[PDB]
């Protein structure tokens, strides 16, 4: 399924980073969070939004992943100082490439060239694509978020928040199914060059992480967006401003592990003896044995209890 405060929530672990959000997928509920709204430069994480515009372009049928795109000199790292040092798909002017293979270059390689080529194809140009990136931050209520460039390079004005990126990540996971799946592909070969997905957590042999993206912000630490499944439930950990690359891996998997062991996401409501609503909730596992629920329409209300404390309330029907 996809949709204030968690009752009797155990104490959060201490988190060594600037900012953090651990969020539930089904509900969007924050399980824990520190300094989550502080404006911080996202660096390459801007590319989550870039992929999202591509996803939404496919979803509205304006493009298709089979569409054959021609690479302008725009999307070629030779002669563009904007690109040197940065990560690339290594496209050449005159290359004819699928939307799909450009989406893989974006995601798996974090290809800055690929962003430009997708941008020109999708909006007709770089600045119109950023207009769309800002329109989709505004639709999604990313109140701390503003973009300037299609790849996050040469963009000192751009900014986001741990919270906003949690929200954007949930929208990404909830979009086109085969788009999100490309975040889990471990490698891409393009024009004779093979490169590795930079998200180390994908190879973790203790979870099912199909996560998003890692990054770094000149003089503001190390950042991460992971997401993990366990059975029928998904968590999203954003970490920002960790000391070191090893920190953000350990802090992100410390968050997700504490999420996984101590909480569950459950179906409270459905169709029966008590609603018209289906309703899902994030609860501590220790709280599951303590939850109690005390013409066409009707006139009472349902009052959900955890132990002897009411938490939420909805009308009573039939």
Author numbering: -14 to -12, 2 to 272, 290 to 309, 323 to 346
Paper text:
PBP6b (also known as DacD) is another putative DD-CPase in E. coli, with 47% sequence identity to both PBP5 and PBP6a.
The construct that yielded crystals suitable for structure determination (PBP6bΔC) lacked the N-terminal 21 residues of the signal peptide and the C-terminal 14-residue membrane anchor. The crystals contain two PBP6bΔC copies per asymmetric unit, which can be superimposed with the root mean square deviation (RMSD) of 0.3 Å on 324 aligned Cα atoms. There is no significant difference in the relative dispositions of the two domains in the two molecules in the asymmetric unit, therefore, the two chains can be considered to be essentially identical. The crystal packing involves the region immediately surrounding the PBP6bΔC active site (Ser42) such that the observed crystal packing would likely have been disfavored had the product of the CPase reaction been bound. Asn39 in PBP6bΔC is 9 Å away from the nucleophilic Ser42, and, should the CPase reaction proceed using a Grotthuss-like proton relay mechanism similar to that of the GH45 cellulase, residues His214 and Ser216 are likely intermediates between Ser42 and Asn39.
